[PDB]
């Protein structure tokens, strides 16, 4: 035997398509482990999930377990340097993150495959001897505060906390999870609490081996991973902590039959219907809640949504089970509301109960369960191979819920038909346990309560007993019918033999006035799936704001019109994406290849013969007005990015321009625009997956023929295939553009140091520099100086040009943010001077692994080719070519590049800053800056600068 292993599990059931090898075990201290050997992986990975979270915070220190989560990265006894962990990962092509929910704290990393043991050693110390350094703790509490600030004016986070504030206030469910500076520092100081001791006591008490699950994925054999994991994790102490459990529901009698009226930040209108239910987790082999969700949440003919949509009351619906914690769950039905829907909330909820009554009338349906079982089995068999980092993290969470042997299958395979469970859940969906929440600006100034942590304005009322009664007597409405058999369920999974003429990259197999067709038969994944991507080029999609509006509205009305039919295809693993672009339209069809030509045909046919329903048109136009308006409530950093895009691209219509133009979109006008849009087009496509050349040629010509037949499409002239250019900033110039975010009380900044056109050498100069400064920028600007939670640095690529950008969101003013980025850039010039040759070669090597990391699934490989196609660079072998050149670079080359393009006194510095002010508006030495040119009018700024050329094709 082995003293350190309690048991090794039996065979871990996996998909027969899965070439990874697996071994489950439990250590003697109680840690549940999954080991995954993949000898092909470029990045290895591990995750650890401790089954404690938020719901176990001390009642007097809200946010503690989330604070501990941040603090664990900031040093341990064996590795006391504050960023030893992140720096180690950065220098070895790795990355890490963590999250805290009510019951789990989950930590994960990935790393270059040769450096697993080093990464994993440093990571294991988190669970053995964190330092919770006093100085780290006082700085890091600012990152958490700033994380909560970002969430404060977000509607989803406000609704999430509001639900917890209106159940039983004594129940742990009512806790505030994120915490902030108030809860984590200010108030504890006032109460004589030593937060460092609290972190140490909480870690001591709950970070117990018996509550942990570990997953490790590496090239090493299963035996080697076994020894590694025993070596590192055997020392975690078992304190035998009982798993926390919450058998009493946070919504008791007095919390039921309540109506909440809520003021949102965005102009949104929604209706939330909720019923408390028991915890159904233990019934995973039948999944009664999924069965009900699938039915109540259906979007096919005869569905609930379908009738609410025809009445013109709602556009969208989500229904089904929602997680609570060990011992309680919820079942939801939530919809968005049209203006007319807002006035018929009562009738909407009755239709919900009529639909529920139809399910009780028909009884549990074994054929529905069989369909669900069959799709889940196909989905599991042909699951795309996952990136290691998300895969270890996700399995760590679920090791707490399923036997070792079933961890891979348990969320997929259904085994038991349980009409008794289906009826038992359905018996809880009754008007006597209903909670109803309406979100709308119409409640402004009509509310009388305020939620503490977010400020949310709402009113609570009992639902009148006569309203409950009307709902309890709901009868059968003849518009509601069970869905019928889903005929998109695929049954042909044959993998076509690899053709003799198959190539490693996409090949241009059709090059005509109408269409350019890039094609590759999958030679790696061997799943019965394909991706079909199309750019439709037309100047009329973006010629003015009005047209761009009409392009959008057309495509939204089209998707709305197809929804009923397309929903079945997407339950059957066949989906599509359709949107207007600054060039035209983009269409992508992905998933099982079997029925895929059927759905594609249908989209092109509808596209080309579309008849707008006038009612759908007014509803979708009003949602779009709101959606443009609601931009004002996005975050300051999203504003800054959005303004830079408008500043640097040749053509770009603002949200304001689109909004003004929107009133002039009439039905007549939209009906005229469509044939005009479709009259002349160019189509560039990538057809990639389980498909032959001649099926690819056939699919392409079928799209052409359908357009030609129905919309009389002719080819665009080559000269009209315009790409837009980037604005060319002058040597030594600095421009600032300044605006205010009217909603958030944080500011945001984007700083862009433009370099030159993209090419091999320029790319790798910028990428290597970015790789070098990446971790230090986060360490400096966030961990040390604490300027904000959101601190970002990296390449910016647009319209064939590039440069270095910095994005920060902070309470500090933008001019101060600027000076800190500038101090930091100097700090980096010195680090680069002082770093060893070997330190320098480790960064080359890390960038190299990053760039050469193999796609693990079809759609990631398609996305690489697609980026070559849409950028018109067509450099399909870029990665080998760029990396060969990268390996040639020296320290001097990067110092010279920095001195020429980036330094404060650089001869070719080209800087633009976007300053977004907050609603209401020791340290290294910042250099003196010149006086900037303040941009007053974006159109004038553009007209007075040159425009770069466009990049040439391979
Ligand atoms: Zn956090």
Swiss-Prot record:
Its cofactor is Zn(2+). Keywords: Allosteric enzyme, ATP-binding, Cell membrane, Cytoplasm, Host cell receptor for virus entry, Host-virus interaction, Hydrolase, Membrane, Metal-binding, Metalloprotease, Nucleotide-binding, Protease, Receptor, Secreted, Zinc. The N-terminus is blocked. This is Insulin-degrading enzyme. PROSITE patterns: INSULINASE (PS00143). It is found in: Cytoplasm, Cytosol; Cell membrane; Secreted. Activated by small peptides. Activated by ATP and GTP, and to a lesser extent by CTP, TTP and PPPi. Inhibited by bacitracin. In vitro modification of Cys residues impairs enzyme activity. Homodimer. Can also form homotetramers. PANTHER family: INSULIN-DEGRADING ENZYME-RELATED, NARDILYSIN. It is an enzyme of class 3 (hydrolase). It comes from the Eukaryota. The active site is at 69 (proton acceptor). The modification N6-succinyllysine is found at residues 150, 655. GO terms for biological process: amyloid-beta clearance; amyloid-beta clearance by cellular catabolic process; amyloid-beta metabolic process; antigen processing and presentation of endogenous peptide antigen via MHC class I; bradykinin catabolic process; hormone catabolic process; insulin catabolic process; insulin metabolic process. Plays a role in the cellular breakdown of insulin, APP peptides, IAPP peptides, natriuretic peptides, glucagon, bradykinin, kallidin, and other peptides, and thereby plays a role in intercellular peptide signaling. Substrate binding induces important conformation changes, making it possible to bind and degrade larger substrates, such as insulin. Contributes to the regulation of peptide hormone signaling cascades and regulation of blood glucose homeostasis via its role in the degradation of insulin, glucagon and IAPP. Changing residue 775 to C: Increases catalytic rate towards INS and amyloid. ATP-binding induces a conformation change. SUPFAM superfamilies: LuxS/MPP-like metallohydrolase. Binds 1 zinc ion per subunit. One of its GO terms (cellular component) is cytosol. A motif (SlyX motif) lies at residues 811-816. The SlyX motif may be involved in the non-conventional secretion of the protein. It comes from Homo sapiens. Its main location: cytoplasm. Changing residue 789 to F: No effect on catalytic activity. Substrate binds at residues 294-300, 317-321. GO terms for molecular function: amyloid-beta binding; ATP binding; ATP hydrolysis activity; beta-endorphin binding; endopeptidase activity; identical protein binding; insulin binding; metalloendopeptidase activity.
